[PDB]
Design an enzyme around this catalytic site. Structure first.
Site, PDB file in Angstrom:
ATOM      1  N   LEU A 197      23.227  37.702  51.007  1.00 45.12           N
ATOM      2  CA  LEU A 197      23.721  39.062  50.791  1.00 45.12           C
ATOM      3  C   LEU A 197      24.190  39.262  49.345  1.00 45.12           C
ATOM      4  O   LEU A 197      23.913  40.294  48.728  1.00 45.12           O
ATOM      5  CB  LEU A 197      24.871  39.379  51.745  1.00 45.12           C
ATOM      6  N   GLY A 198      24.914  38.277  48.817  1.00 54.41           N
ATOM      7  CA  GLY A 198      25.447  38.347  47.466  1.00 54.41           C
ATOM      8  C   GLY A 198      25.877  36.997  46.913  1.00 54.41           C
ATOM      9  O   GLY A 198      25.700  35.964  47.558  1.00 54.41           O
ATOM     10  N   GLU A 199      26.434  36.998  45.703  1.00 52.23           N
ATOM     11  CA  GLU A 199      26.901  35.763  45.071  1.00 52.23           C
ATOM     12  C   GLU A 199      28.223  35.994  44.335  1.00 52.23           C
ATOM     13  O   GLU A 199      28.566  37.129  44.003  1.00 52.23           O
ATOM     14  CB  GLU A 199      25.838  35.214  44.110  1.00 52.23           C
ATOM     15  N   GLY A 200      28.967  34.918  44.082  1.00 53.12           N
ATOM     16  CA  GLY A 200      30.273  35.036  43.452  1.00 53.12           C
ATOM     17  C   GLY A 200      30.691  33.879  42.557  1.00 53.12           C
ATOM     18  O   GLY A 200      29.916  32.950  42.312  1.00 53.12           O
ATOM     19  N   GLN A 201      31.932  33.939  42.076  1.00 55.28           N
ATOM     20  CA  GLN A 201      32.460  32.964  41.125  1.00 55.28           C
ATOM     21  C   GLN A 201      32.609  31.567  41.732  1.00 55.28           C
ATOM     22  O   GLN A 201      32.444  30.558  41.039  1.00 55.28           O
ATOM     23  CB  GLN A 201      33.816  33.429  40.582  1.00 55.28           C
ATOM     24  N   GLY A 222      31.255  30.702  45.209  1.00 50.61           N
ATOM     25  CA  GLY A 222      30.564  30.804  46.480  1.00 50.61           C
ATOM     26  C   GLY A 222      29.702  32.050  46.616  1.00 50.61           C
ATOM     27  O   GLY A 222      30.029  33.104  46.069  1.00 50.61           O
ATOM     28  N   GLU A 223      28.597  31.929  47.348  1.00 48.11           N
ATOM     29  CA  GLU A 223      27.753  33.077  47.676  1.00 48.11           C
ATOM     30  C   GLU A 223      27.862  33.435  49.162  1.00 48.11           C
ATOM     31  O   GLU A 223      28.336  32.632  49.962  1.00 48.11           O
ATOM     32  CB  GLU A 223      26.305  32.790  47.306  1.00 48.11           C
ATOM     33  N   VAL A 224      27.419  34.633  49.525  1.00 47.56           N
ATOM     34  CA  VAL A 224      27.606  35.134  50.887  1.00 47.56           C
ATOM     35  C   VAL A 224      26.274  35.305  51.592  1.00 47.56           C
ATOM     36  O   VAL A 224      25.379  36.008  51.110  1.00 47.56           O
ATOM     37  CB  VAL A 224      28.369  36.475  50.899  1.00 47.56           C
ATOM     38  N   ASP A 274      43.088  45.027  42.679  1.00 49.09           N
ATOM     39  CA  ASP A 274      41.756  45.530  42.323  1.00 49.09           C
ATOM     40  C   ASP A 274      41.183  46.458  43.393  1.00 49.09           C
ATOM     41  O   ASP A 274      40.018  46.341  43.768  1.00 49.09           O
ATOM     42  CB  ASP A 274      40.788  44.360  42.072  1.00 49.09           C
ATOM     43  N   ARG A 297      34.141  49.674  45.257  1.00 51.08           N
ATOM     44  CA  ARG A 297      33.275  48.486  45.128  1.00 51.08           C
ATOM     45  C   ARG A 297      33.827  47.272  45.880  1.00 51.08           C
ATOM     46  O   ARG A 297      33.105  46.308  46.129  1.00 51.08           O
ATOM     47  CB  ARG A 297      33.071  48.106  43.657  1.00 51.08           C
ATOM     48  N   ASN A 298      35.108  47.314  46.220  1.00 49.91           N
ATOM     49  CA  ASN A 298      35.722  46.224  46.967  1.00 49.91           C
ATOM     50  C   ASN A 298      35.942  46.552  48.448  1.00 49.91           C
ATOM     51  O   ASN A 298      36.574  45.789  49.173  1.00 49.91           O
ATOM     52  CB  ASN A 298      37.051  45.824  46.303  1.00 49.91           C
ATOM     53  N   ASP A 333      37.823  41.792  48.599  1.00 50.09           N
ATOM     54  CA  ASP A 333      37.997  41.566  47.160  1.00 50.09           C
ATOM     55  C   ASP A 333      36.905  40.615  46.694  1.00 50.09           C
ATOM     56  O   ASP A 333      36.957  39.412  46.963  1.00 50.09           O
ATOM     57  CB  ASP A 333      39.394  41.004  46.845  1.00 50.09           C
TER      58      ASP A 333
HETATM   59  O1  LIG Z   1      37.116  39.507  50.315  1.00 50.61           O
HETATM   60  C1  LIG Z   1      37.076  38.398  49.789  1.00 50.61           C
HETATM   61  C2  LIG Z   1      35.801  37.574  49.547  1.00 50.61           C
HETATM   62  C3  LIG Z   1      34.963  37.312  50.781  1.00 50.61           C
HETATM   63  C4  LIG Z   1      35.161  36.127  51.488  1.00 50.61           C
HETATM   64  C5  LIG Z   1      34.402  35.857  52.625  1.00 50.61           C
HETATM   65  C6  LIG Z   1      33.441  36.751  53.057  1.00 50.61           C
HETATM   66  C7  LIG Z   1      33.248  37.936  52.350  1.00 50.61           C
HETATM   67  C8  LIG Z   1      32.264  38.850  52.794  1.00 50.61           C
HETATM   68  C9  LIG Z   1      31.420  39.623  53.149  1.00 50.61           C
HETATM   69  C10 LIG Z   1      30.441  40.552  53.535  1.00 50.61           C
HETATM   70  C11 LIG Z   1      29.522  41.075  52.603  1.00 50.61           C
HETATM   71  C12 LIG Z   1      28.579  42.003  53.046  1.00 50.61           C
HETATM   72  C13 LIG Z   1      28.581  42.377  54.391  1.00 50.61           C
HETATM   73  N1  LIG Z   1      29.460  41.888  55.301  1.00 50.61           N
HETATM   74  C14 LIG Z   1      30.375  40.990  54.869  1.00 50.61           C
HETATM   75  C15 LIG Z   1      34.013  38.219  51.192  1.00 50.61           C
HETATM   76  N2  LIG Z   1      38.223  37.737  49.335  1.00 50.61           N
HETATM   77  C16 LIG Z   1      39.569  38.212  49.312  1.00 50.61           C
HETATM   78  C17 LIG Z   1      40.500  37.492  48.533  1.00 50.61           C
HETATM   79  C18 LIG Z   1      41.798  37.946  48.438  1.00 50.61           C
HETATM   80  C19 LIG Z   1      42.215  39.097  49.064  1.00 50.61           C
HETATM   81  C20 LIG Z   1      41.301  39.809  49.822  1.00 50.61           C
HETATM   82  C21 LIG Z   1      41.720  41.087  50.476  1.00 50.61           C
HETATM   83  F1  LIG Z   1      43.043  41.263  50.467  1.00 50.61           F
HETATM   84  F2  LIG Z   1      41.281  42.135  49.764  1.00 50.61           F
HETATM   85  F3  LIG Z   1      41.309  41.348  51.716  1.00 50.61           F
HETATM   86  C22 LIG Z   1      39.972  39.399  49.954  1.00 50.61           C
END
Ligand SMILES: O=C(Cc1cccc(C#Cc2cccnc2)c1)Nc1cccc(C(F)(F)F)c1
Length: 291
Positions: A14-18, A20-22, A150, A154-155, A168
């Site tokens: 679905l995506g990628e990150g700093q 880990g990717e999803v 943030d 977009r988040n 996030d």
């Molecule tokens: O949200 C994240 C990162 C993260 C971690 C695990 C899975 C996914 C996803 C996904 C996804 C993408 C497309 C469709 N369906 C699902 C995203 N971290 C985070 C870190 C601190 C605070 C918060 C808060 F407070 F905002 F919730 C969030």
């Protein structure tokens, strides 16, 4: 005790990150996994999104991944992303969350028009419903004294029937690079969403989250058609913070979106009050938007 990693089957990225990717994953016959932490309705396989730490990750990336697990373990609200499960007793490290089938809210709204090859429209009440859900999630984070830092469309993630969860995804995605101000050796800053005192002092509070909510609400009512202060440079956005500080009536505001009635715009303006304490609490914002 870990979620059983073998019950996950990879489908697509679905995506990628700093750190880990999803990946979109399938869970076959998930009925035996149901619990207070792992809900289920049930297209009989369950779809989940899994953030995974890849094999070549730096030690710094691994540490950030393990801290993200901890941070997300705090989150227990219908309008905040949730950890359904983790796999951390061995590698690969995994975070399991709900699949949000309509992706990020910015792309979702960008693909709709306000109600006047199909044509995706969204109604004014549904826009309000989107906004109310964001305020409800933030109301919950405020009770935890958890500062998001943030908030922006977009988040946010979109599920079925216009359900919204705040998430996030960090500040390094190429897609939204223009939403951040980068100075070498400094924290990356989402300045167009930041309260004047944040720009001048670099500190984030629930009250600056309320300001960012005001900007997020403006995005929603714009159906994400343009960047906040889009015709101004990053430097001008930073100078605008100075004009709030001086308080001589020369600071400027985001304009009223076409879909936004004056009463709702006045609420946005309250979110951008110079004084932190005069900004409405999320409990009040949610009540207004929902009722
Ligand atoms: O949200 C994240 C990162 C993260 C971690 C695990 C899975 C996914 C996803 C996904 C996804 C993408 C497309 C469709 N369906 C699902 C995203 N971290 C985070 C870190 C601190 C605070 C918060 C808060 F407070 F905002 F919730 C969030």
């Amino acid at each position: 005790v870990d979620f059983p990693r073998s019950r996950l089957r990879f489908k697509e990225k679905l995506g990628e990150g700093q750190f880990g990717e999803v990946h979109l994953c399938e869970v076959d016959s998930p009925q035996d996994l149901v619990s207070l932490d792992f809900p289920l309705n049930v297209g009989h396989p369950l779809l989940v999104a899994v953030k995974i730490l890849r094999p070549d990750a730096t030690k710094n990336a691994r540490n950030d991944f393990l801290k993200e697990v901890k941070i997300m373990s705090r989150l227990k609200d219908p309008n905040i992303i949730r950890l359904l499960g983790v796999c951390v007793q061995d590698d690969p490290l995994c975070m399991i969350t709900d699949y949000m089938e309509n992706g990020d809210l910015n792309q979702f709204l960008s693909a709709h028009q306000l109600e006047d090859p199909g044509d995706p429209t969204i109604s004014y009440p549904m826009l309000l419903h989107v906004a109310a859900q964001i305020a409800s999630g933030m109301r919950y984070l405020a009770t935890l004294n958890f500062v998001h830092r943030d908030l922006a469309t977009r988040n946010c993630l979109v599920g079925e029937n216009f359900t919204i969860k705040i998430a996030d995804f960090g500040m390094s995605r190429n897609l939204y690079a223009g939403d951040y101000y980068r100075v070498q050796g400094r924290a990356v800053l989402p300045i167009r969403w930041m309260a004047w005192e944040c720009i001048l002092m670099g500190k984030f509070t629930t009250a600056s989250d309320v300001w960012a909510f005001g900007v997020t609400l403006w995005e929603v009512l714009m159906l994400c058609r343009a960047q906040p202060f889009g015709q101004l440079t990053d430097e001008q956005v930073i100078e605008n913070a100075g004009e709030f500080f001086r308080d001589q009536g020369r600071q400027v505001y985001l304009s009223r979106p076409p879909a936004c009635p004056q009463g709702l715009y006045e609420l946005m303006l309250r979110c951008w009050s110079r004084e932190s304490e005069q900004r409405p609490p999320f409990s009040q914002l949610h009540r207004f938007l929902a009722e």
